[PDB]
Design a protein around this ligand. Structure first.
Ligand SMILES: [NH3+]C1CCCCC1
Lengths: 255, 253
């Protein structure tokens, strides 16, 4: 009849702490991010979750987050599957740049569009970009279901959904319909893309949805795999709203 | 050789210092065992290994070993598959017992026979055993390819090969033939079992094979997946030989 699953975005690493777009740059979790993953695992253990399958992106921070959660649950044996289709949205040329600096240079309105709009596309990352090489030279992108030269160089949230939706429908959703307990260790925007779809959020309303880092996201789906109600956050609601505000404030100018 | 494959047994756990038979008890790696895994990954990175698939058992120490290896390699994205068929030999009633104590009581030769014989089956573990419940009540064994009551309660090395061979033939071997570079993160005796098979080691000769912890083992196979030479421990042979002696000495008074 109804099905519940868990999705979340990993804890913040070095870059996001200093307010820089990370996106496809394969940055590892820091001490704080690791602890955040362990805390999510402890929460899920308290709820006595017994996962059957775990899905992650190919960015190591989402994989490590999943590994830490499984360790906390004593479920390291549970199958894990990783796909670039769950990768964080590709911020193109904006990768590595400071969000507040962009707000000062282009205005808060434009930054909000780049960050949260559905259709706005970031300028494409070019070969001259400081982080182009370490991204596209990695073997993980040489064995994807799409050619290396075919992978995106930037993505709007709509682009993300277009490449993520097929993975959800074809590899995750079937497991949900089989009654399996699933965990999705993803990122801020790839998660927003999935939620927009599952909750039927309008192209206009999705711009106001911001997800806090390191917080289990609860979602219940119906027989048609559509949300029964809006997504919920597991934990201290005040700390969670404060965390959401922090993320929103990274795109704003001081005082 | 036509194909190359890497297999290894994980680093130490708490019962290594205590020198007790761990077997199916899901003990975690200790600080040293984790470092052993990191050193394996660094050694594999130094040799440019790029894995396409990783196989482990369902005992967490072998999984964490694979994870630590992949991290050192920057290959955390490589698919991992786990199976009880790769689990360490089931020591039955001997689980939890101190090896040196048994050697003192029954003789080093007796303990050596129980540890390395290909045919001797240890006494089955009974419900009254101190670690029976901690083993058979785990969900991981409720979802394997055979019923919970079908799982072994003790195994000779021969029994191990018999339940491991099907997995090798069905899941691992095909991937190797496809040209994929495979990493098998297993245990001391389940690894000896696979080596016996791949190298065509006799029932008598397998007794003399003891594997060191946390050392990558390179196996080169031909078109028929038969070893084209004895296994090769990757690293300093002197340190490796001392590591082998360490494992042997666990059974000496
Ligand atoms: N990142 C933190 C957000 C508030 C709950 C604990 C994790």
């Amino acid at each position: 009849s109804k099905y519940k699953l868990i999705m979340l975005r990993h804890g913040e690493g070095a870059w996001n702490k200093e307010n820089r777009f990370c996106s496809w740059v394969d940055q590892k979790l820091n001490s704080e991010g690791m602890e955040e993953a362990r805390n999510c695992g402890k929460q899920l253990k308290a709820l006595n979750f017994e996962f059957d399958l775990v899905f992650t992106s190919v960015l190591n921070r989402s994989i490590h987050t999943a590994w830490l959660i499984l360790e906390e649950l004593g479920q390291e044996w549970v199958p894990v599957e990783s796909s670039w289709r769950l990768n964080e949205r590709h911020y193109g040329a904006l990768i590595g740049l400071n969000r507040e600096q962009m707000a000062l240079n282009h205005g808060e309105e434009q930054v909000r569009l780049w960050r949260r709009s559905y259709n706005v596309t970031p300028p494409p990352i070019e070969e001259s970009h400081p982080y182009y090489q370490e991204i596209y030279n990695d073997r993980r992108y040489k064995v994807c279901d799409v050619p290396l030269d075919q992978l995106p160089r930037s993505e709007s949230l709509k682009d993300v959904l277009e490449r993520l939706l097929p993975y959800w429908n074809e590899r995750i959703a079937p497991e949900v319909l089989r009654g399996k307990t699933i965990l999705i260790s993803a990122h801020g925007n790839s998660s927003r893309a999935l939620l927009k779809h599952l909750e039927g959020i309008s192209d206009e309303d999705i711009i106001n949805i911001t997800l806090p880092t390191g917080v289990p996201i609860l979602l219940e789906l119906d027989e048609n795999l559509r949300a029964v109600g809006p997504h919920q956050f597991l934990g201290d609601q005040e700390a969670i709203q404060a965390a959401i505000k922090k993320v929103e404030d990274q795109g704003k100018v001081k005082q």
